[PDB]
Amino acid sequence: WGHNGPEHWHKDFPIAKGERQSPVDIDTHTAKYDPSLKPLSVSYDQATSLRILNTGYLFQVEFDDSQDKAVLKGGPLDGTYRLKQFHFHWGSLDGQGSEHTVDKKKYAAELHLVHWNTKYGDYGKAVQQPDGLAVLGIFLKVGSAKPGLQKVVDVLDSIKTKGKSADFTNFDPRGLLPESLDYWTYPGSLTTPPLTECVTWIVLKEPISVSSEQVLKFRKLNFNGEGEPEELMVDNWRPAQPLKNRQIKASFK
Ligand SMILES: NS(=O)(=O)c1c(F)c(F)c(SCCO)c(F)c1NC1CCCCCCC1
Ligand SMILES: [Zn+2]
């Protein structure tokens, strides 16, 4: 999988045609304000980043999730979700790259901060539960630079190819958040195989702005390993999937 794009994944993972697949188009006019959504709590003051890795499909920054350092709580969530890693999906052009869309609009990229429900003890147990993960999704549009992103961009040359990693300590993910925490939420899935339906998605309404030069540097990563023909790492997003009977709730309006 990666002739092997998202339209093929159902043959190995039949849940690809399931009832709670992600991403989805967020129709802002049909999302329902839910005044009962409890306040969202993003507590990242003790986050401990470890490493950055080129997985062959995207890059990710991993955290020490062996204690409750950085956690997500509140909003639609019951209980405590620990930050495990963040990663991005992005496009070959500035008008595509996000996984979720808003009124059919695609953004240049989307940041996913992935958290697992600590009641399940480990993330591998959490991924087999309907409420195992909470992913905070943040859109990226191209405009002014994002200062809090530059440390990540500057390390990408050291993880150009599949399977490279590098130390990535002391990175503060708070620098990647927009001002507002207004959000939409809905039940969905992972967006790559095995596509399991274990995610409570929380998608922030306010995008962050990143510079043309920052996203250009995402696009110089490679899907291939070292010493293999170069395939630029672009368009690593899954398109919107049918919403089926689901309701998207809004925390605002
Ligand atoms: N959008 S997403 O969160 O489904 C996601 C991808 F689309 C990916 F393409 C990747 S890289 C391929 C899987 O190793 C990914 F790590 C995650 N997240 C991981 C989160 C950590 C543990 C849960 C398992 C899913 C992979
Ligand atoms: Zn993702």
UniProtKB/Swiss-Prot annotation:
Record entry for activity regulation: Activated by X-ray, histamine, L-adrenaline, L- and D-phenylalanine, L- and D-histidine, L-His-OMe and beta-Ala-His (carnosine).
Annotated coiled-coil segments of the chain: none
Annotated site residues (Involved in the binding of some activators, including histamine and L-histidine) in this chain: Q85
Cofactor: Zn(2+); Co(2+)
Gene Ontology molecular function: any one: cyanamide hydratase activity
Assembly, per entry: Interacts with SLC4A4. Interaction with SLC4A7 regulates SLC4A7 transporter activity. Interacts with SLC26A6 isoform 4 (via C-terminus cytoplasmic domain).
Protein family per UniProt: Belongs to the alpha-carbonic anhydrase family.
Note: Target of drugs used in treatments against glaucoma disorder and breast cancer.
Linked pathology: Osteopetrosis, autosomal recessive 3: A rare genetic disease characterized by abnormally dense bone, due to defective resorption of immature bone. Osteopetrosis occurs in two forms: a severe autosomal recessive form occurring in utero, infancy, or childhood, and a benign autosomal dominant form occurring in adolescence or adulthood. Recessive osteopetrosis commonly manifests in early infancy with macrocephaly, feeding difficulties, evolving blindness and deafness, bone marrow failure, severe anemia, and hepatosplenomegaly.
Protein's name according to its UniProt entry: Carbonic anhydrase 2
Lineage, uppermost ranks: Eukaryota, Metazoa, Chordata, Craniata, Vertebrata
Gene for this chain: CA2
